[PDB]
Every structure is written in structure tokens, then in C-alpha cells.
Symmetry: D3
Subunit: 244 residues, 6 copies
């Protein structure tokens, strides 16, 4: 398959216009997209060790969820120099689907919603991020699902008692900012996401919002694996994962 055909396939599943404003999605590093592709590698992060592993495994197309850079640069030294050197010497294409993969149907957030069998799920934010709906069961039933399918030991901020058939909000990745806690506290009883910090925990306790941190890594990798299997079933391509 040609690189531009892989890119079109991905953009059919997760359209570029779904990405929130300023999100650096699409081609990160690459020249010729008529290049033919024998081995695609998928990763959560375009980290130095992921890129080293890609070179070692003979990956020619590297797909990551997070962009290579959020902040623009005009100098090439240290780590970014090492990364680009490996990608350019091996002519490895680096392509990213970030918030457009979180938001799209059957994307990262939908995967979580599907896992918890959320009743009548709606988007958590107006831009499309996250899902919220009724969880048909008890809080403990919700915890056992999280522990078995997402993360063995989630941090639970038990701000209040939770009744059965509660409102559950999910957001894969970093959803536990202070501003998110205040917003979601008005929309849900329980909030499942990643990257909890001190001030957010205090805030969650004050608002009576139950927060479950199943980590940034695990809440995205769950959906990313399903996406990887989707790629495998539909492309006549060797596909491997590098950091999950």
C-alpha cells in the first residue's frame, strides 16, 4: 500500500476536521507519500525509545496518537535532533491522529463508552470530547470493569456515596484538569479519566464529584488497541504496536 492510501484510510475513520482548534494532527514528518508501505507501527507517543524501536523493527510508517511537537521550534538539537535523524535517515513517515481520534465515532472516547455500556451516550463537551451517560449498575460493578479491562489499580477519589444507575462521564487521556473537574461536576456523578493532580483532587472532593484516575496511558491504550485491530482486519499490511 502507498502511504497516502494509509493516510486516507485513517482520515476516513477519523476526519481531520473533528480535531479541536490548534491541534497538530496529520503529517508530522515525511516527504514522498507515494512511497509503498510494508510495515506500519502504531504507538501512543512519538517518544525517543518508540522511534528507536521503529527503526529496529523496520517500520516504514509510524502512526502515533500524540503529535511529535505541540510547541513549534526553530532549532534542532538534543532529543528532537535525535528523533528527526532516525526518522529521516530511514525515511520513516510519522503521522498523527490526536483529538480527531478521541472524538470520532468508535474512537477512543466511544470505546470507553462502549466498554461501560453507557445508556444513551452523549458527548461530554461541545467540541466532541468525552462521553457521558447512565451506567446501568452499581459503583462496585463499575470498579470491577475498570480494574479488569482498563487498569488494575485505579486511584479513586470517593467524594460522595454513589447510587446505582448513576451518570458516568469518561474522557480518555488528560481530562482531570481543574477546569474539567468544575465542568463535569455539573454533568455527572462519576468521572473516569487520567492524570490526576493535587489541586484537582481537592477540587473534586469539594464539588462532590467522584473521580477515578485509571491513568492517561491506560484510558487511551484501550481504544488504541481496538483501532490497531481495526487496521489489521482491513489493511493487507503487517501492523505492530511499539509502546503497548
Amino acid at each position: 500500500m502507498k502511504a497516502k492510501e494509509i493516510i486516507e484510510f485513517i482520515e476516513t475513520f477519523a476526519p481531520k476536521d473533528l480535531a479541536i482548534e490548534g491541534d497538530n494532527i496529520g503529517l508530522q514528518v515525511g516527504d514522498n507519500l507515494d512511497k509503498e508501505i510494508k510495515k506500519l507501527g502504531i504507538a501512543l507517543d512519538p517518544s525517543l525509545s518508540v522511534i528507536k524501536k521503529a527503526e529496529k523493527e523496520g517500520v516504514d510508517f509510524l502512526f502515533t496518537h500524540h503529535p511529535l511537537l505541540k510547541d513549534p521550534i526553530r532549532n534542532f538539537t538534543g532529543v528532537i535532533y535525535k528523533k528527526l535523524k532516525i526518522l529521516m535517515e530511514n525515511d520513516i513517515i510519522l503521522y498523527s491522529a490526536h483529538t480527531n481520534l478521541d472524538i470520532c465515532k468508535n474512537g477512543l472516547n466511544d470505546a470507553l463508552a462502549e466498554l461501560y455500556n453507557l445508556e444513551n451516550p452523549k458527548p461530554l463537551y461541545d467540541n466532541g470530547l468525552g462521553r457521558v451517560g447512565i451506567f446501568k449498575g452499581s459503583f462496585e460493578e463499575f470498579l470491577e470493569i475498570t480494574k479488569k479491562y482498563i487498569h488494575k489499580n485505579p486511584i479513586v477519589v470517593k467524594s460522595k456515596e454513589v447510587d446505582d444507575n448513576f451518570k458516568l462521564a469518561v474522557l480518555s487521556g488528560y481530562g482531570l484538569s481543574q477546569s474539567s473537574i468544575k465542568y463535569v461536576a455539573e454533568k455527572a456523578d462519576v468521572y473516569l479519566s487520567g492524570d490526576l493532580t493535587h489541586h484537582s483532587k481537592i477540587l473534586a472532593e469539594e464539588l462532590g464529584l467522584v473521580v477515578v484516575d485509571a491513568t492517561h496511558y491506560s484510558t487511551e491504550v484501550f481504544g488504541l488497541k481496538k483501532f490497531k485491530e481495526f487496521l489489521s482486519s482491513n489493511l493487507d499490511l503487517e501492523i505492530i504496536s511499539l509502546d503497548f
Copy 2:
């Protein structure tokens, strides 16, 4: 003692001009500073449950490390309504020493520097946040000191092997931001602070900086306990802690 006498004592120990710019230090909520003070309460956070406890324990002067508000507001509803209502009905004075207490001599960062017996301690930043110096011993010894005195199960990002007599940087509270990691990576082998997130962990691994997250809470409470003993020994005032 009168409230203004307590404040002057605190500002002698931690001068207001030491605070980094835009830090909301000083009087948070207050009326008459000629008021005489029955009970001084010290807390990390001016949280709802802390302020409730202050009211219940008869605290009239509430000292917190974190300010009540970082972002200004023009509406008084929900949680902030509940907090202000308690402080004003009981005429409880709320006063904060934030980064000025982090930076001053024998402050929150110096306490950490003394604990690890840093050789030739220097300020980590030019504004004077954090401390940096040589730890005279092994990484495992460093860990057991951390585990016994700060936090029992710190998260360790072991990006590289660390030699004996390595450079240790310490920062009480939230010091594990992405920009901090890139800055400290140029100055230390090991970085001890709080509030780790995914992107920070990945970045530390790429730069080979060993990060130890002993939590935001514990890295500040350690110095705060020391400050509490300092106040008790010098003032003729009943002094209690509310969230530690």
C-alpha cells in the same frame, strides 16, 4: 496576640517580596487586623473541609500555604459561597504565604534540602524556587530516606542508572511540569518533586532525568510541619493543623 502581629511575624520569616510575581499572597479574606486571635490554624489548602474544621475547632486565624483564589472572580456561588460564608460569619481571618514560604531561608524547599543533607545547596531557579546540590550516598539510600520521611510509595521514573554522589534537585509541590523537566535535566541527575503526569514521565525518560514523585501534598507538608513547630515555639498562641 493581634492578627497584625501574627502576620508581621510570618512576613519576617517569609518576606512578601520573595514571592514570585503574580502570586496571590497575604490577606485573602479579612476585616479588622486589630482583632485579637484565639487559635491559629495552619493548613496546606483553604479547602471547604478545612474551613469547616476551622469553624468547628474555633480557629479565628486561618493560615494556608495555597491562596484561596488564583483566578479572580465576580460571582459568589457554589463552593466559594460556602467558604466565604463560614469565614465571614465567624470573622475568621484567612492569610496565605505561598511561594514566599517556598523560597525563604528554612522554607519549604530548604527543609527538603536539609533532609537530604545536600552538599553546597543552591537555588534551582533564578527566582529562587527549589534547591540543588550533591547527595552524598547511593540512590537506594536516597529512596529509603524519601520513603521514611516523605511518602511511602513514591512513583519512580528510572530513566537511567544513577551513580553514587549524584546531583539531586528538590522542589516542594508541583515541579514536574514539562518545562521544569527540560530545565532540571540540564542541572541534576535526580529530580524530587510532586504531581507527575504522563507527558512529563515520557519527557524525563527521553532526557535521562530520574524523577521521583513523592506527591505535591507530602513534599510541602514536610516543611509545613517544621514551620508549625517554629510558630508554636515562638508565639503565645494555641496552634493546630487542619489538613495534616
Copy 3:
């Protein structure tokens, strides 16, 4: 009746979406809106003496035209401390309808337009503020209506002679800014509003726009009284005015 029922009634009459950009309308100070309301107080300003008077008269719901704060704050001392203390210990709800009450049908600007019986009244600004139309009569007749119903001694900047059946623009409150003078000069012969200042007077004279300052207070209180009687006729509630 409940506070939320009063708020619903007010927002039916003056919907919040009519409010101009950045206008601080709605709930100013308050927590529980299921609270029941025995006595509603209406005022132009949430001033210190108004709030003391509300407390003295046993007002539990205080409605004001101007918001409590335009500039946001993060510290609570002095005058604002006194205001909140009185509202919170007595659990008095403070609620505001500002520009949404100026713009709505039968609102503050419509009340003035109806008084002068403007022929074919149009909004003065595109956002909804002010009214403009033909006054069917002489300038002297317009002055007598002003003197009898709005303000006994208005300041008149007679920049030019005014013919019968002239175009009259009205704007309740502060409409005599320099920018307004230049805008209205293109739309009307006579401009009736409040809060005239030196530079604005000069500008009106240069442009030949006749400006009548019947004061900020009086141009809003006229419509506010009408609103008060509307509330009285429709709610089974004791209603008093506090600064008019």
C-alpha cells in the same frame, strides 16, 4: 414561592441571551435557589446602604439592575467584605438583570420610548441598546415631558435649533460617552440619556447634536418602577424598592 421561580419569571421577561458581551448578569451572590422568598427587594444599585437596608427590612431576595462587580477580584477586604458578610449571614440572594433588562421588550429603553410615544421606534444600536424614532411635537413639548416624568432639571446642551417632529434617541443610563455622541449624531437630532462629561459636551456641540442629560439614575429608575409594578401585579409576593 421559590427563588428559582422568581428568577424564571425575570428571565422570561428579560432573557439572559439579550445581554451584551461580557455583561455580568444573573446570580451575583447565592447558593440555594430552592429557598423560599417572603420579601423581594428591588434596587438600582447593590450599594452598601442598599444591602444594609435590605437586611433591615428583612429582604431575602435582592434584585438589582447593576451587577455587584464589573472587575473580578481574588481578595476579600474592605467594602466588598462588608457587602458579602451582610448578604451571606442573612442568606440574602443577590440577583441582577442588567443590559438584558435595558434591551428586552417593555424594558428600560422601551419604557422611555413609550413615554415620549416615539413613532416607529427602532433599536438605537445593533446589539439592542437604546431606541430611536420620531417625536411628534416640538422640542419644548419634549422638555416638559422630561421635566414632569423623568427629571425636574435636566442639563440641556442646545447645539442647534430643533424643528418639530424631530428624531429622538433615548438610552437609559450611561449613554453619553464620546463614542456614543459621535454615533448618535448620525442618527438623531436629540439624544436623551445620562452621565454627561466635559469632552462629551464639547463633541455634541461640534456635531450639532442636542444632548439632554436627565441623569443616569433617573433614566433607569423610570423603567425600573414600571418593572416593579409588573412584578407586584403578577407575583404573590411582598415587593419593596430600596434606592427609589
Copy 4:
């Protein structure tokens, strides 16, 4: 009585009120004019560079028009309407328009000092760090202060009597527009009584809450008092015909 070059008039004015005294962004100095070697037979002084002041300057044969307020505060890139009418008159008649604004407010014996001397303020200090306004003790009763205001500044001042004021009170003066909400909050911590101009509703309410006594003797009159003194200074020192246009 003789003629003077425009640049000599400007040098004299800037000696009395140096330009670096002006606060940030204040549009002081030459407003309209090209050649400063121009000879000047008649100097005109005004508070405002208004249309009617400029018409009067043309009618009276003024060659050099001095105003306290600048022609423009906000820059423009189109020349129509009133600004067109003003520039046409200034340019057709080759009239130089020059302004000393906050530098005239702040300088020694300037507009604010004129008020401080009028009320014989004890130990006068600048009200702001930029040097606007004056503050000191008025040695007498509030009633005496009011009669001075009424006799020398304005006959019917607006008084916001927020509290009773004792004899020998602290008085702040600010010529022109000093009654903004932020000024009221600042001066409330420095004085019992605040004398200035351009009172508005929200400011009055704010003064009442803070217990600051505010006296509005108008923007016009509080500057014109000092401007008349400035005109007299010019008349006695320059051998030039000097007239006032809006006072």
C-alpha cells in the same frame, strides 16, 4: 509689543512645563503645523481645540493656537466631518496648533499647583506617582473650603457628602477629570475630601460607600482657574499679544 518666532514660544512653554513630565502616551507638543520659524503676531489660549475655538482663532487673527487638551487622543486615517473642518481652518490660515496637556498639570505652578495654592494646602504632596494632583491639609472648616470653591472655581458645585468632615482635614485636588471609579478608590485612602471634575453615577455611589467626600466643581472650571494664571504668566513675560478663546 513685538512678533516672536513660533519656536521661541514653544521653547518658553517647554521651559515652564517640560515635555518629559507628561504621562505615558499623552499626545503633547505640536498638533498641527509645519514651519516653526513662522513669525507670530497673536497667541491664543484655549482649554479645548474645539471647532468653535478654532473658528474664533481664525476670526481674531490668531497665528499660534495653544490648547491644554490635544486635538486627538485616538489616531485616525480618514479626514472627514469635524476633523476636516478644523484642519481646513488651521491649514488655510497657517495657524500653528500646539498643546501642553499633563505636563502642564504636573509642573511647578501648573494647573494642580494652582489649586493647591488657592486652598493654601499645608505640606502639599503629589497625589499620584506620575505627579498628577496635590494633597495636603486644609487649615480650616469644610464650610470655609466650600466658600473658596464657590467664589473662585464654581458657584454651584456638586457635593457628595459621604461623611462629616472635621476642621483641618486632608484635601486632594485634581484639575480636570479625576472622578473615575479607580481614582475614587485610590484617593479614598489618602484624603477626607476630593476636589475635581466630571462626576458620574457609579463614582458617586462608590464615594458614598468609602466615606470619601467628593466635590465636583466641573472639569472646565478646575482647569480654567490654572489656565488663567498660565495666561497671565505668558502675558507678563512675552512681548506678544495674547488672548483667551473659550475662557
Copy 5:
């Protein structure tokens, strides 16, 4: 004819809403638009020498393509004083149609597009600046048309060989900015415009875009002459050009 009738005629041909954002079009200098106009002067620039010539020729209405000022001023000295003095003393109206004249049908860009007989011309930018389409002929033929009708000695940046029937973009005026070069390189083989500079030339060479600089002046004057002839055929007015 009255000045307002001339203005209406021009705005019918080139509506002001076509002008790009922030473009200072319309009346530059003038008060009364009922003035009678015997002689219209048309110029590219409202320069000092053009304005002197307008006065010398008894021009009553001066139409320029470029505005008098792009950046606003609050002081009137030097050149702008001299320009305004001549315009106001001699009662000359100055009016400009800038980018609305570039963009409109049969405007400056359409004039260039028709000259080179572009097949299926489309606007180059989304705001409607420039034209792009296929030039039916060889590069040498394109070049000889340029030399005969626009400028005898254009600067040619021959970054690549050009095939017959190539894509030609034209932009009258300043179209050779670095940003434009990067944008047009994706849309055309050859770019005709004005005001080439060093960094733009280098960039054109790197991208393989052939750039032809026929100067800012000539690429606009070509269309301006066509517009002048249009005014002559339709208005019963004496019409002269001042800088072409």
C-alpha cells in the same frame, strides 16, 4: 456631476464589501459630497507630487488606488501636513478603491487574467485576490506578452523549466511576499506579480516556482488604465491620469 454620484458609480463597479479586512478604502479626505465635479484625476498613489499635480491641473475629485494612510496618526506635520493642506485649501476630494478594485469582476486582477487569456481563471486566494488558470502557449510567449504590455524588462527567477500550457498565477501589486510564494508554489508553475525581494527569490528557487517581477507599479497600472477608459466612456466628465 456631484461627487456622491461618482462615488456611487465606482462602488457599483467595485463594491466596498469586496475589500479585504482592515483595508482603508472609501473617502480619504473630504466633507461635502454634494460638491460639483468638473475634472476627475486618477492616480496609483496619493503621493506628494501627484497631489501637487492635481492642484495644478484643477482636479476636483482625486481617485487613487492606494489609500492616503495605512497607519493612523494623531499629529499633522511634514508631508501629511503638506498633502492635506493642498487638498483642503483647493477643495479637492480624495477617494480610494484599493483591494475592492483588485478583486471585483473586470478589476485589476481580471485585467491581467484577460491579457494572458487564462483558461478557466479562478481566484488565487479565498478572499478573492489574484487569478490563476492555464496559459495556452509556451513560457516564451507568456514572457513576450509581458514585455510588450506590462514591463519591458521584468526580473525572471527561472527556478525550473516551464512546459507549454502551464498554470499561471497573477497578482497585481505586492504579491511576492514569502507567505505568498509558499502558497502559490502549490497552485501554479509561474507567478506574475511585483515587489520581489531577496528572501522571496531564494524561497521561489527552493520551491521551483518561477517568479516574474513586472514591478508593483506596472502590474497595477495596466488595469488602472482600463478602468480609466471605463470611467471616460461612461461619465460625462473630464478625466486625466496623474502618475501614469
Copy 6:
């Protein structure tokens, strides 16, 4: 003739043109490179880090590429097209790219000084406060000045002859792009004749209105003149093969 480590080359260059001399936001110093202990046998010097310069560097075995202009002024977060092609060549060949931009314009014996010495300006002073360019009196006629320009800089400069120029006039020089509209308004008050590069239409008109004589000897030639002098400076002091790539 021997090899040098990259850091030794950088140290020599920064002694001649210290980095703190660079104006605000100027992207000077290391552009592309990781290890500065790298050994350098061949130094390449260029005006622009263009694609064709970088291709030529690769072909000539350049290990250290010095350019006057930075690789990027505007930061980027995607690597495609031309920048991809440039970095690929630099990274594959382990070529260090380093730049001295305005710090080379401003330092003593830099690009602007080279021009000032060339025209033998009497009492040369910095043109700007930062301080780009030089200004002083040219001891001679305009025709003599024009012939020096034609001899050393560019045979065919564009001359905007806004006025007649008397002998012993004030000459301003600025290497590179100095003919912006704002520069012209500034220089018009400081000199009779302005020598620089990159003239555009609006700038030409503006110079004609202000009576400032502008001579465009191109952006390229006015910088290459001083760059050649810098290249010879490096040759005499470093035992390295040094070649130029776009001049």
C-alpha cells in the same frame, strides 16, 4: 593545516561577534546539530542556508556550515517539503549548521563596519540604537560615492534621486534589508543618502516625498561584501579549508 572541533570554531566566531549583540528575537547560534565535539576539516560559509547551498555543502564534504541568515525565523512543528529535504541532508551527513545574523551586522569590523570603512565615513556612528547600520559624512561628491558603490558592491544599483546631493553629505549604510517604509522615515531625518537593499514600490514613493536619496545595491551584495571580509578573516586565523557556497 589541521582539524578543529566544532565548539572551537563557534568559540572563535563568538569572540568576533558576541551573541549578546544580536537584536531581540534574533535566532542566532546553533541551528542544526547535536555533538559539538565533532571534528571539522572543512568549513563552509554562506549567506543563506538555502536548499541549493545545503546540497552543495554535502557535495563538497563540508562538515561545518556557517550562514549569515538563520535556517528558520518562524518556528515550525511539522517537517515536510523543503525543510524536510534540508534537514535530511544535514542529518545524514552530520553537518553542523551555525548562524551569526545581526550580531555579525553590529559587531566591530562586521558587515555594517565593512561598508562604513569602504566609504571612509568621517565620524561614523550607529544608525539605530540597537545598533544596526552606520551613519557619517562622506568626504566627496555623490558621483564619487556612486562609483565606489559600482566598483565594490554592485554595478547596477537602483537610484532613487529624490533631490540634488551636495558634496560632504551625510551617508547612512545598512547591510541587507534596510529599505522598509519605517526605516526610510527614520533615516530621512538622519542622512541625505541611504545605501541598503531590497527596495519596494511604497518605499520608493516615500523616499521621493521625504527628499531622501535611496540607493539599492541589493540585499545580496551589501551583505556579501562584508561576508567576504569575514571569510578571509577566518582563513588567516583558522587552519581549516574554508570555502564559500553562494558567493
